[PDB]
Amino acid sequence: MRAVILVGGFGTRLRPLTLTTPKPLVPFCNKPMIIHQIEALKAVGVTEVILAVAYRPEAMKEQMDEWSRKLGVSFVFSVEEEPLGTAGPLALARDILMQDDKPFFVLNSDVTCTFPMQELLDFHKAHGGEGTIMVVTQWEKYGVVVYSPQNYQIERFVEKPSRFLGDRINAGIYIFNKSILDRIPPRRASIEKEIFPAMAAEGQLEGFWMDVGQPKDYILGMTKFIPSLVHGNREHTEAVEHQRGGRFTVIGASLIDPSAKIGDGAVIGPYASIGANCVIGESCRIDNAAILENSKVGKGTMVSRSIVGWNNRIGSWCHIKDISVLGDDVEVKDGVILIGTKVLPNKDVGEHRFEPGIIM
Amino acid sequence: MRAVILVGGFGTRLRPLTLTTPKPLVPFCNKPMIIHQIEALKAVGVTEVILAVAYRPEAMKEQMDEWSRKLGVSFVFSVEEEPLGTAGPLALARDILMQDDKPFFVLNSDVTCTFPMQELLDFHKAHGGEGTIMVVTQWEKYGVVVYSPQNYQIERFVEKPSRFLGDRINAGIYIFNKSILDRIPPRRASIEKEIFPAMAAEGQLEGFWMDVGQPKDYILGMTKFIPSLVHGNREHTEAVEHQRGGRFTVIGASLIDPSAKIGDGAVIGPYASIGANCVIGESCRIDNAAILENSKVGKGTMVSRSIVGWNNRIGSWCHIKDISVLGDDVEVKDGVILIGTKVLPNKDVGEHRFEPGIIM
Numbered sequence: 001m002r003a004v005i006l007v008g009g010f011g012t013r014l015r016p017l018t019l020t021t022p023k024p025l026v027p028f029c030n031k032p033m034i035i036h037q038i039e040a041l042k043a044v045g046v047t048e049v050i051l052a053v054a055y056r057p058e059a060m061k062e063q064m065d066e067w068s069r070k071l072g073v074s075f076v077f078s079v080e081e082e083p084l085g086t087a088g089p090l091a092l093a094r095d096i097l098m099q100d101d102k103p104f105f106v107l108n109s110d111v112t113c114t115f116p117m118q119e120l121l122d123f124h125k126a127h128g129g130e131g132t133i134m135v136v137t138q139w140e141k142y143g144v145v146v147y148s149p150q151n152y153q154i155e156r157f158v159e160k161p162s163r164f165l166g167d168r169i170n171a172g173i174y175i176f177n178k179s180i181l182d183r184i185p186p187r188r189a190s191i192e193k194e195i196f197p198a199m200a201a202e203g204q205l206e207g208f209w210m211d212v213g214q215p216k217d218y219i220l221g222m223t224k225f226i227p228s229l230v231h232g233n234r235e236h237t238e239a240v241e242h243q244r245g246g247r248f249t250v251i252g253a254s255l256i257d258p259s260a261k262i263g264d265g266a267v268i269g270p271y272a273s274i275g276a277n278c279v280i281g282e283s284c285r286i287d288n289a290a291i292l293e294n295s296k297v298g299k300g301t302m303v304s305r306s307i308v309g310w311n312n313r314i315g316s317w318c319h320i321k322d323i324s325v326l327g328d329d330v331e332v333k334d335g336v337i338l339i340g341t342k343v344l345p346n347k348d349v350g351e352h353r354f355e356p357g358i359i360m
Numbered sequence: 361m362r363a364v365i366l367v368g369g370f371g372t373r374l375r376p377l378t379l380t381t382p383k384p385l386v387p388f389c390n391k392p393m394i395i396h397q398i399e400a401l402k403a404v405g406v407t408e409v410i411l412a413v414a415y416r417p418e419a420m421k422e423q424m425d426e427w428s429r430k431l432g433v434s435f436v437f438s439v440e441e442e443p444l445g446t447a448g449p450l451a452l453a454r455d456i457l458m459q460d461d462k463p464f465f466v467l468n469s470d471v472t473c474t475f476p477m478q479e480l481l482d483f484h485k486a487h488g489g490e491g492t493i494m495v496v497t498q499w500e501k502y503g504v505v506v507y508s509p510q511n512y513q514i515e516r517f518v519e520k521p522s523r524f525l526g527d528r529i530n531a532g533i534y535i536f537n538k539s540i541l542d543r544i545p546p547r548r549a550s551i552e553k554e555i556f557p558a559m560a561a562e563g564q565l566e567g568f569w570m571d572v573g574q575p576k577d578y579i580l581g582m583t584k585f586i587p588s589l590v591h592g593n594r595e596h597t598e599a600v601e602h603q604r605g606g607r608f609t610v611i612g613a614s615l616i617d618p619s620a621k622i623g624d625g626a627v628i629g630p631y632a633s634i635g636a637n638c639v640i641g642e643s644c645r646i647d648n649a650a651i652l653e654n655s656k657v658g659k660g661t662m663v664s665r666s667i668v669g670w671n672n673r674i675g676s677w678c679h680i681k682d683i684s685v686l687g688d689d690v691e692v693k694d695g696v697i698l699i700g701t702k703v704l705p706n707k708d709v710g711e712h713r714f715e716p717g718i719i720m
């Protein structure tokens with residue numbers, strides 16, 4: 001009946017875009033990352049969502065703008081505890097308890113997946129079935145390796161193992177009962193306070209899944225996510241949008257906001273997202289690239305596998321390839337080639353850069 | 361009676377420190393960069409200072425904290441016009457006119473100098489005697505080259521000449537009459553609207569001067585500014601502070617805030633500034649380096665010619681040398697050598713870096 005979407009965090013990995021907005025609020029395809037999770041929660045039975053915001057309490061205005069659909073007015077913060085925010089639910093143990101006794105969801109704000117949120121009780125084991133489902137199944141470099149047998153028990157929980165195998169990792173979606181928030185409230189920073197050794201049953205994804213918190217991870221998660229969205233959003237059959245401006249061709253599926261304008265002959269490539277009010281030149285190539293909002297693009301650029309930030313002004317014949325994240329209000333001169341270079345907000349690029357790097 | 365301190369600007373050059381606070385509010389030696397100018401204006405006969413803040417209107421709380429001494433309560437902003445903010449005085453031309461008719465000062469927020477603010481009329485002409493005094497006398501790469509003969513006239517005004525010689529550049533302190541704000545109010549972005557090629561005189565710095573807006577410029581400006589401050593601030597005779605914690609030695613002049621703690625045997629080098637609540641290890645070497653606030657330093661680091669941001673935690677045996685600005689809340693492990701690497705806020709550094717660069 002309640003959920004705790006952890007939104008407090010510096011977003012260091014997604015830095016060029018998170019210097020302006022918090023990581024929950026940077027759009028993934030056409031909506032902020034938290035908005036997908038909030039919509040899934042609205043689909044399942046829940047009304048009030050509490051947010052533990054630490055990095056920037058200025059997200060309140062944007063949440064109020066998005067407050068129309070759901071009662072996500074709750075906001076709590078006293079002092080920076082941790083981006084992981086284990087004390088997050090513990091620092092607000094009073095609100096979750098007295099209002100209701102139902103189990104409460106806990107989610108990361110940078111996770112995208114099918115979002116099952118099944119109405120099935122699954123009361124024999126709360127987090128074992130959900131989160132990392134047992135047949136997640138990816139590299140062990142990031143995320144905690146979870147060792148679960150066929151009987152749905154968790155024995156080992158190592159946040160960043162060096163080399164321990166165990167391709168299974170937690171999805172980032174947790175469901176907890178009222179005992180967890182009253183179990184270990186140490187009143188200070190901690191890491192998820194997982195005490196799975198003590199218990200095996202009820203004490204507490206068959207689908208795509210990706211931790212969308214890194215630029216390359218952002219691109220790959222968008223690539224995995226757009227095909228799964230073809231069923232619901234806007235259902236000319238090659239992609240979601242195929243005729244918005246002039247006459248352009250689309251290869252594969254893509255998300256184009258009806259407010260955007262596309263030039264004559266642009267080739268919106270596979271798994272590309274175009275934001276609101278964005279303008280695309282005559283013969284651009286948007287190949288697995290995300291255009292956030294209000295960005296303008298000249299005639300013939302090839303933004304491929306990279307991210308173009310808000311209010312950008314891309315030149316006429318640029319080439320923004322590789323994984324090169326552009327910040328807010330970045331202007332690129334004509335003919336500039338950017339390959340894997342991250343540009344901080346409010347910068348002008350006029351020189352070529354053929355190697356990965358940072359532009360101050 | 362009034363002054364216009366231009367404070368609206370992204371501070372792209374001093375980027376690692378200006379991602380947290382606006383460039384006017386980044387401390388120069390022990391006080392915010394704007395506080396020196398406000399103190400000079402308080403010394404001269406003015407009472408109200410109007411600030412044209414654009415980049416971050418959240419400086420209001422800090423200004424109110426510094427408001428106790430002088431009535432700098434004025435704050436105006438509608439939409440981003442320009443970091444130069446030529447429309448700044450023009451956007452608030454109404455307030456300046458009706459209250460008073462006396463000439464109003466215009467100052468940059470990133471300029472440090474002797475700050476004459478002479479009670480003399482400068483009635484030969486107003487900006488000319490002040491600002492770039494006819495004798496400024498530095499490189500022509502930045503700032504406008506001003507061609508001033510012995511009769512105090514300005515003929516040419518080129519913002520960024522390619523190669524025009526003319527070592528004289530404007531200091532950045534302007535004084536204007538009420539006609540300038542009513543002369544060209546174009547209502548949009550413009551560059552200083554200098555129409556001096558029309559008028560010779562009366563229509564509108566023998567000391568150190570430095571445009572403190574770049575890291576190397578910050579260091580050099582501190583090096584020039586500290587010796588000139590020995591006359592008035594705190595008047596054991598080697599530096600301003602020589603006994604604050606244990607027993608340490610000082611080479612040359614330096615500012616150490618009485619709230620700081622210095623270890624046994626630390627060598628505070630020439631022209632160094634230590635912020636409030638800062639802790640310095642046993643055998644550190646602070647050679648022409650600035651420690652902003654609440655930063656902690658281990659035993660034996662040599663921070664030389666670099667800037668250490670707020671709330672830092674420097675390791676035990678690091679080498680933060682060359683021009684290497686550290687952002688807010690940056691933690692450096694023991695033995696890490698940083699040479700010319702700018703670190704963005706909220707980062708942990710554990711690897712050596714022998715070449716100039718940027719750490720995300």
Ligand SMILES: Nc1nc2c(ncn2[C@@H]2O[C@H](COP(=O)(O)OP(=O)(O)O[C@H]3O[C@H](CO)[C@@H](O)[C@H](O)[C@@H]3O)[C@@H](O)[C@H]2O)c(=O)[nH]1
Nearest residue numbers: 006007008009010011012023083084108109143144172211
């Ligand atoms: N950096 C950041 N982290 C945030 C933010 N909002 C919430 N967080 C939380 O910060 C935690 C850790 O930071 P991330 O970079 O997002 O996660 P991680 O350290 O890569 O790994 C964590 O997430 C995995 C999910 O893929 C999980 O294995 C587990 O949460 C792990 O600790 C996550 O639980 C996430 O909820 C934000 O704006 N920025």
Ligand SMILES: Nc1nc2c(ncn2[C@@H]2O[C@H](COP(=O)(O)OP(=O)(O)O[C@H]3O[C@H](CO)[C@@H](O)[C@H](O)[C@@H]3O)[C@@H](O)[C@H]2O)c(=O)[nH]1
Nearest residue numbers: 366367368369370371372383443444468469503504532571
């Ligand atoms: N970037 C930035 N600029 C600011 C800020 N606050 C005010 N400004 C104004 O922005 C103008 C230009 O930005 P700067 O980087 O500070 O100056 P500049 O472009 O290096 O050169 C300008 O300053 C010289 C003084 O040395 C002058 O020649 C003249 O102002 C010139 O346009 C200056 O007039 C300064 O007052 C800020 O927070 N950030």
Ligand SMILES: [Mg+2]
Nearest residue numbers: 108110211213
């Ligand atoms: Mg994450």
Ligand SMILES: [Mg+2]
Nearest residue numbers: 468470571573
């Ligand atoms: Mg300047």
